[PDB]
Structure 1
Amino acid sequence: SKFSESTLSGWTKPASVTEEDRIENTISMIKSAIKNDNNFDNLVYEVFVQGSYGNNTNVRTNSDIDVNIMLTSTFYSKYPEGKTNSDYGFTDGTITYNEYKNLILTALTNKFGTGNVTVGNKSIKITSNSYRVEADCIPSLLYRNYEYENSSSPNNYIEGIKYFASDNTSVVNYPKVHINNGIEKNNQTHKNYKRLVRVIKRLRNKMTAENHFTNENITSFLIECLIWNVPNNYINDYDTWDETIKQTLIFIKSSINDNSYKNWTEVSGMFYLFHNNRKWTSDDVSSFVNSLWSFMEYLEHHHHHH
């Protein structure tokens, strides 16, 4: 490629943490907002980091931390066919999602101030200078998937999250499963899986910045999922980032062309990566990979002259 091995390696680095305790302080301040609100006293819930910070795939220190505030004493379920809540001894919920969200908003408002809480479509932004909290908060309910492994046992399920965007469309994710699977792949690749994620994100940004290629449907989450689908041998068998990226692009192109991409899941394994309601298409990813291939000049220009 046109980039040195030193340059590529720099672009694999985790984003610097200019706070040392940013994740810690952020989780702790949000937890404090909830725990001191008496209206949560009888509720069970978890405050945890998801997205790029939860996966250690963040490439910019300035980016916002995604914090899930997940209710678990009331939850949603996916059952095997023909089963209902009463087959598992459950009610339809002692609190609705909107009631829970409004409690969360009150707690966050009391902690951070009404002018520093903004409700977006899929998250609540906290911009608190006083407590140094810059975070996207996702209030969710735990989602108990009993169907995936066909569990009739109330305590055996795959754990996800579910919430309703501000337009009331349903969103189901499996952030903890995603995190666990990404840790596993990192362990199997000598920590090079997440390094590869980070350098491909930085190269996407560089292609946009330098007017080579721009496609708003190529999200960071998509890039992480694409790289998670690269077989470990393409990461473990090479001695340079140049060659690792080269083989990654060859593999993704081949997999779109031979339709095997249709079996790829997101990192959680719980949804397919490509389908008709994703923001991206296979054409988008083909274009992205082709553009990266050209940007990196894996086909060297004539006489090494651009």
Structure 2
Amino acid sequence: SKFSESTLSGWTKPASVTEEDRIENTISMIKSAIKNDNNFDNLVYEVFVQGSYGNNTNVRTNSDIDVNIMLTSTFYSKYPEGKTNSDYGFTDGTITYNEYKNLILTALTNKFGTGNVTVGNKSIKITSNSYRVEADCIPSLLYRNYEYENSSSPNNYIEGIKYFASDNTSVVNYPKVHINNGIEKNNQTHKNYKRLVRVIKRLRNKMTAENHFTNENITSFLIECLIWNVPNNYINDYDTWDETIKQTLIFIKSSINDNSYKNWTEVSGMFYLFHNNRKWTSDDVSSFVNSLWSFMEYLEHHHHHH
């Protein structure tokens, strides 16, 4: 085996939290910025953690926290065919996305300072030394998907989020559904699902750092989604991390080769993992898996000599 079980197990650990209450304090500081801004008094909204921190798959203490600020008193919707807002008694909305984003910008600027707020293409970066906030905030509107289960009941929908990037292109995600499904799979695998996610991400980083393989399209979200598609038996049936990773790579390769990967969803189940507008391709993932296979030396080198 290339790496000992102690080494692999170390690489399955969650990133240490240098500040014990970092997530809670970050959420609280952002919530405080909003709740004390009178212009949000008539609005209903949630501040919640998503991404690696939200899924407890973060592997680097230094990474920034993804925080969603989601407006819910005004929302977007996906309806069944032929239905409109008026079929659910809804208006087009009392506030637009851009107006909401500008209110958020004012609130965050009053809290953290104009020099510590930076609008990016996809999120608003807060770098507040004063309040200990290192966060990428995504202002979003709740996204009510009535079409997925064909619900005519206004209160029955799949809940996602929708925002507009700085180029005014639309982005729809289901971070809460993702988080819930990932928790479920962790519960079904004796907590080994997220351990596997973490070690694969760390091996990706190590392959990049040691000049074995680099591909900027192999994102942390992609890796999490790939491992989530690994059937629970490949995680529950083996007694070493070495073997678990070996079988994971065999399965992913086989699933790309036989085209079953085309039916894989992301963790949320609301979009397919591979399609023509993802950053990655199936070739990217095949390359990643092949390079990890060679890096782990699952085919032992001749005479155990590199």
What TM-score, normalized by structure 1, do the two folds share? 1.00
Cα displacement (A) at 1:49: 0.1
Q: Point out 4+ residue stretches in structure 1 off by more than 2 angstroms.
A: none
What is the distance in 2 between the residues matched to 1:172 and 1:187? Answer: 27
Cα displacement (A) at 1:292: 0.1
SS in 2 for 1:166: coil
Cα displacement (A) at 1:111: 0.1
SS in 1 for 2:198: helix
What is the distance in 1 between the residues matched to 2:234 and 2:2? Answer: 20
Cα displacement (A) at 1:92: 0.2
SS in 1 for 2:250: helix
Unaligned runs of 5+ in 1: none
Cα displacement (A) at 1:209: 0.1
SS in 2 for 1:100: helix
SS in 2 for 1:156: coil
What is the distance in 1 between the residues matched to 2:280 and 2:177? Answer: 22
What is the distance in 2 between the residues matched to 1:298 and 1:8? Answer: 14
Q: Cα deviations across residues 93-140 of structure 1 (Å, max 9, x unaligned)?
A: 000000000000000000000000000000000000000000000000
Cα displacement (A) at 1:54: 0.2
What is the distance in 1 between the residues matched to 2:20 and 2:294? Answer: 38
What is the distance in 2 between the residues matched to 1:195 and 1:5? Answer: 13
Cα displacement (A) at 1:81: 0.3
What is the distance in 1 between the residues matched to 2:40 and 2:118? Answer: 21
Q: Cα deviations across residues 255-282 of structure 1 (Å, max 9, x unaligned)?
A: 0000000000000000000000000000
Cα displacement (A) at 1:86: 0.2
What is the distance in 2 between the residues matched to 1:121 and 1:256? Answer: 32
What is the distance in 1 between the residues matched to 2:204 and 2:143? Answer: 33
SS in 2 for 1:47: strand
Unaligned runs of 5+ in 2: none
Cα displacement (A) at 1:12: 0.1
What is the distance in 1 between the residues matched to 2:234 and 2:296? Answer: 18
Report the identity percentage. 100
What is the distance in 1 between the residues matched to 2:2 and 2:77? Answer: 50
Cα displacement (A) at 1:144: 0.0
Map of 2:304 onto structure 1: 304
What is the distance in 2 between the residues matched to 1:16 and 1:134? Answer: 16
Cα displacement (A) at 1:234: 0.1
Q: Cα deviations across residues 145-172 of structure 1 (Å, max 9, x unaligned)?
A: 0000000000000000000000000000
What is the distance in 2 between the residues matched to 1:202 and 1:123? Answer: 25
What is the distance in 1 between the residues matched to 2:58 and 2:289? Answer: 21
- Paired residues for 1:1-306 under 5 Å: 1-306=1-306
Backbone CA RMSD of aligned residues: 0.3
Cα displacement (A) at 1:39: 0.1
The number of residue pairs the alignment matches comes to: 306
What is the distance in 2 between the residues matched to 1:53 and 1:228? Answer: 17
